[PDB]
């Protein structure tokens, strides 16, 4: 009986309204369901987007992903339990897609039935608070420029975090005569084709954008980091190096004594969970982490059990995770899920914050977040899907990295679903300029 | 004995914040005054910023201006009448000077009192709601990300209108492998070095960024417009032509049939009035134009008289039409001038909206507005400024843009508060590729 927001209708939204789907097609009552995206699709990050910056309507644009974006995890590892590969694709296909054919994934699994018509598009949320036992929501119809309000038993935040860009200051980037660009902004690598690259980062970004740079034509590029460098195996024309010091005209200059000839600055720095839309009281404040605290089971707000949120820790895991998260988010809603005490909540939030501060390398990341997602699976109904094999694909994969960084794309996985053994794609990474779904599909 | 809150410490915020410090310094009482900013420091667009997007803490960025900008109209147009410019400078000095010389102006005339304690920085407004006859504002101390609350009397909306972009889509633009950006974005001119450039606009932006462009070497610019050419004087490397139609990868192909292959379209495609910040009863609506309605003498709101906008015109005057209104702000709240009766004051908007809605060319809306801040002018205190020197300078300074767009700049106008002739400059602007203001202001 009870009224359910969702905001974004990105993976983790979907998650949740096909989560709710399940229920419905069993002939199960549930909630009414309202899902707000401020974009004009579904989809979220896994939508390209030519535009940068803020749209047409001065909503800032949430989308991250680059043109010839190839997905950088086994496919495999991502895969729904409720709606395999095989299933949608209807054979094998290789285990790193192209963004549109795992896009095409995705939105398959909630385009049968009547998930769609429950989200409004070009709607942006801006205020939350709760009050009298309700969330009382403003949201923005982008379109007509006019606010509009509901009000709402459950709120389930699914907005992201890899969307409104970490964007640190450098010396000399007042008078440097290049671009200077966070990764966010990316969305060619042919826009730097000829060009000195200098890249800041040691995460996904920064590996992938270098790499993505590199095979698109970049003269150099040249990787700064921090702390320590991610050390992969670069190919001829790249290198790593200690920390920027300054830019000094079309020089970047690093604390190791390195100058580079730069054309382009792209700051490969991480993003902010931004939640400008809830009240204080309400929002989660964090860096990117494996376990934010507050989040009971890494998803109720400590404070309002009411409160939902959704894909908010770091990811090794990312589709399926969602998922876990979700079936639990909404057998919470349905009240099939109790709440412990408040005393048995804090110890258990303690417990899984203790362990993740802990966390030393890779391989106990992925150990952590695979005994994170599979309690998560045991306490609800999210299908049969192996995650000891998921375990092990992930820990294969980073070994992949480590030994060739340019070829790791080239590797199959099996299904932790259906056992299907990926085949090998007809074209090396390196050499793979046709992106295309119909090329992919063979 | 009120309370007055400012949001922004660009031009017209200072301008308000010089305004009543004028009061104070003759011993006048004046009401406490909190001003909101969320840049680190005050100017307004006249600061640089190399950022685009949005800053370090999610905040949109407000900055708009580029490396190498230069003023597009005489200085003198723009003057302050209680801070000449040969006071500041103390000596004259040419009419068309680089950003940093102007933004020296700007803040010179602040930074000698007390008005830049009055400022918050790096602080947001985001919530303004009018209840039981008080403006409750929540604002966003951005270094700490924490929100904060205050009320006030009075509320003086200084935010611009030329920071929030408006950016079309065109057909092609999802498989154009090039960039794609607003001129908000645009920074530094090299960055286009040896490229293919279209620019679509036809206003300002669009003329500036396409001469900078050119002036820094890009291969080409294209210039697409819907309605009209600019049909300014372009130089070797320059064309203007009708209407995008299409990117076809890397082709950019128009209506009137030219293709051109392009590396980069950037739109000068113009702002927002956006206020996401104000309750929806308080919000001004309004495309970019020389008079939007329900804004009496252009500052304050209608359906709530403590609710005051500066500068939301679009501009061929701007600091001391942003002084006169900003005059007029302070003396209305200070109760000096009453409010009319509300039919009175509708009567009056539409008398300006009328005669704003007929203007056919840029003489006519030159007078305009002129004669609209010449009347903000009579009604309060503001020094002595002759506008009708600028009506002039105005209408020249057009006539040199269509005789040559590249040599405008090199002209010479008389102040209209000391009568100063400013002298020609030691290099003429289509050669002068470092916008220092150590350069402009030294022997060659
Ligand atoms: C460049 C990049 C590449 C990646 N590649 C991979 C990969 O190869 N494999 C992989 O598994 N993962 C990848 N990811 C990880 C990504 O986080 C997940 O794949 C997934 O997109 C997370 O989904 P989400 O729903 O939690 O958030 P999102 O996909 O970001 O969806 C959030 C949605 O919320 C909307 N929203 C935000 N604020 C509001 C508001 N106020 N009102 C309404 N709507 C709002 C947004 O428009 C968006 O649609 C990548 C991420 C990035 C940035
Ligand atoms: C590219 C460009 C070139 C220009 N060149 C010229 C020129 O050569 N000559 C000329 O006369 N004019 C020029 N202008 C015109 C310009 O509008 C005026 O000169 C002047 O800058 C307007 O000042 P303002 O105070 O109204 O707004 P702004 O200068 O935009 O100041 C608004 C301030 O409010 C702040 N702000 C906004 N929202 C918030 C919030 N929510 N909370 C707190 N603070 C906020 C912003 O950070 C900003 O500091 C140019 C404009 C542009 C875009
Ligand atoms: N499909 C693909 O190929 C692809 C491509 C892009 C990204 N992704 C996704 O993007 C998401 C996020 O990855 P991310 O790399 O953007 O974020 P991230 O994992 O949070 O990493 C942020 C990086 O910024 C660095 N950093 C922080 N402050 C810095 C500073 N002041 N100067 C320089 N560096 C700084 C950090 O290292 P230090 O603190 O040591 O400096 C860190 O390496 C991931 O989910 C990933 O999957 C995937
Ligand atoms: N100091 C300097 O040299 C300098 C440099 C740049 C800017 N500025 C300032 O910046 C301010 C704003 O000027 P502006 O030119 O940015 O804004 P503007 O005056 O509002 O002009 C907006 C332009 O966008 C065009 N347009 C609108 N929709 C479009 C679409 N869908 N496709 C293509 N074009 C579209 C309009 O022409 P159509 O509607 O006919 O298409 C118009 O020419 C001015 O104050 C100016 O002084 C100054």
């Known amino acids: 009986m009870s009224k359910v927001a969702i905001i974004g209708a990105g993976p983790c939204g979907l998650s949740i309204l096909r989560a ?18 401020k974009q004009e699709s579904w989809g979220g990050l896994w939508n390209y987007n030519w535009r940068t910056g803020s749209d047409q309507y001065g909503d800032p644009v949430p989308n991250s992903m680059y043109r010839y974006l190839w997905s950088n995890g086994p496919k495999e590892c991502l895969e729904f339990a409720d709606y395999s590969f095989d299933q949608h694709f209807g054979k094998s296909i290789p285990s790193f897609p192209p963004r549109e054919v ?53 709120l389930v935040v699914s907005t992201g975090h890899f969307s409104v860009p970490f964007i640190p200051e450098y010396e000399g980037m007042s008078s440097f005569p290049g671009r200077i660009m966070h990764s966010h902004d990316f969305r060619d690598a042919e826009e730097f084709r000829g060009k000195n690259v200098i890249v800041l980062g040691s995460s996904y970004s920064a590996e992938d954008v270098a790499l993505q740079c590199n095979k698109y034509g970049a003269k150099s590029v040249t990787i700064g980091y921090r702390h320590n460098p991610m050390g992969f195996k670069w190919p001829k024309g790249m290198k790593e190096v200690h920390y920027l010091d300054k830019l000094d005209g079309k020089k970047a200059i690093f604390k190791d004594g390195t100058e580079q000839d730069a054309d382009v600055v792209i700051l490969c720095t991480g993003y902010l969970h931004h939640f400008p839309f809830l009240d204080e009281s309400l929002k989660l404040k964090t860096h990117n982490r494996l376990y934010p ?96 094999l998921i375990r092990k694909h992930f820990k294969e994969w980073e070994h992949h990295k480590v030994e060739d960084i340019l070829t790791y794309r080239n590797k199959s996985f099996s299904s932790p679903v259906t056992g299907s053994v990926a085949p090998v794609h007809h074209t090396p990474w390196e050499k793979a300029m046709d992106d295309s779904m119909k090329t992919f599909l063979n």
């Open 102 to 154: 795992l896009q095409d994934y995705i939105l398959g699994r909630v385009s049968k039935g009547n998930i769609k018509n429950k989200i409004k598009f070009n709607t942006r949320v801006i205020n939350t608070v709760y009050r009298n036992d309700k969330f009382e929501i403003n949201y923005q119809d982008k379109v007509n420029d006019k606010t509009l309000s509901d009000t709402f038993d459950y």
């Open 293 to 388: 605290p507050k989040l009971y089971k890494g998803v109720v707000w400590q404070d309002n059990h009411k409160l939902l949120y959704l894909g908010m820790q770091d990811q090794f895991h990312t589709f399926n995770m969602f998922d876990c998260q979700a079936w639990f988010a909404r057998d919470v809603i349905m009240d099939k899920i109790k709440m412990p005490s408040d005393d048995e909540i804090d110890k258990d939030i303690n417990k899984w914050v203790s362990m993740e501060e802990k966390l030393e390398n890779p391989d106990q990341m992925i150990d952590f977040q695979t005994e994170y997602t599979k309690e998560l699976h045991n306490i609800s109904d999210y299908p049969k899907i192996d995650f000891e």
């Open 20 to 37: 709710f789907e399940h229920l419905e097609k069993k002939g199960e009552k549930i909630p009414e369901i309202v899902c707000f995206e």
